[PDB]
Every structure is written in structure tokens, then in C-alpha cells.
Chain length 88, copies 2
């Protein structure tokens, strides 16, 4: 008995860990791997000519401690905003 | 074709909107509907054998504009924090 919410979150955690495990801390997502993740997972928005600095800017707004990575919470905040074109 | 992330997000929004459409504004979640959602969607963690105050507190924290509802961005911040036991809400 696994709910829709449990299934969806498990998928999000699984994708996040696949990319966070490629460099840096195993539990945070480097900027470079966020870029790769967005191209693979949200391809309808982050395509070939997506401005290289569209991510540079928004990645600064999200990386709270300025360590060059986002944790899962910061990551979900971004994905949720993109999907609803939230102000940020 | 739809990625794991697109599908999961669409699922989270669909569940949120199912409960948000039950009362008040169609696009926001009342406190009572949040409790119902959490018990049905994260039943192992929540339920009726839990503490009401747990929800009065978290609800006040999530309701950024103090209008008595939660938007999806605030809701998903909670769900994500729970699945990782994040310090924001876990004292
Ligand atoms: Na990492
Ligand atoms: Na960081
Ligand atoms: Na509502
Ligand atoms: Na609100």
C-alpha cells in the first residue's frame, strides 16, 4: 500500500540521488549536475539553446549556504516553481 | 514521452488539487483538507493517533500570507522536508 504521494516522492528522491552521487557530497546536487538533470528530466524547457546563465542566476537564489550545491529541499523548491512558473 | 520528474510532479500536483478543490479556493489547501491529505497520503507518519498541535504549528508555518490556506509551493516544501527529516521542521 503505497500512495500516489509516496510513489512520486520516491521517484523524485531516486532521480536526485542519481545525479547527486556523481560528484561532490553524495547528498547534495552540484550546479553542473543540476544542469544535466534539468536537461534530461525537464527537456521541454531546458533544451539546446537555454541560456547558460539562466541557471547561474537562479542557482544562486537557491543555494542557501553558498556551498555550490543544493540539498533536496532546495531542489524540490526549484522543480515545483518551474512546473508552475512561479515568480522566481 | 514524460520523464520520471515530470510524472512525479504532475502526480503531486494532481493529488494536491484533488484536496484543494474540496473547499475554499480551488487552488489552495485548507488546514482541514491538509490533515485529510496527510493521513491518506502519508498514513504511516500521520493519522488520527497523532498530535493535532503538530498540524496547527506546521500549518501556520506553511501559510506564508496568513490567509488560512496553503499553496502548492508551500505544501511541497513540507512533504519534501518530511521525506528527508529536514531541520526546518524537525526540532
Ligand atoms: Na553531489
Ligand atoms: Na548549498
Ligand atoms: Na481549497
Ligand atoms: Na496562505
Amino acid at each position: 500500500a503505497t500512495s500516489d504521494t509516496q510513489k512520486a516522492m520516491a521517484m523524485l528522491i531516486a532521480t536526485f540521488h542519481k545525479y547527486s552521487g556523481k560528484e561532490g557530497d553524495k547528498l547534495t546536487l552540484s550546479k553542473g549536475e543540476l544542469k544535466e538533470l534539468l536537461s534530461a528530466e525537464l527537456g521541454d524547457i531546458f533544451g539546446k539553446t537555454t541560456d547558460k546563465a539562466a541557471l547561474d542566476k537562479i542557482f544562486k537564489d537557491l543555494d542557501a549556504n553558498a556551498d555550490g550545491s543544493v540539498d533536496f529541499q532546495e531542489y524540490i523548491t526549484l522543480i515545483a516553481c518551474i512546473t508552475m512558473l512561479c515568480n522566481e
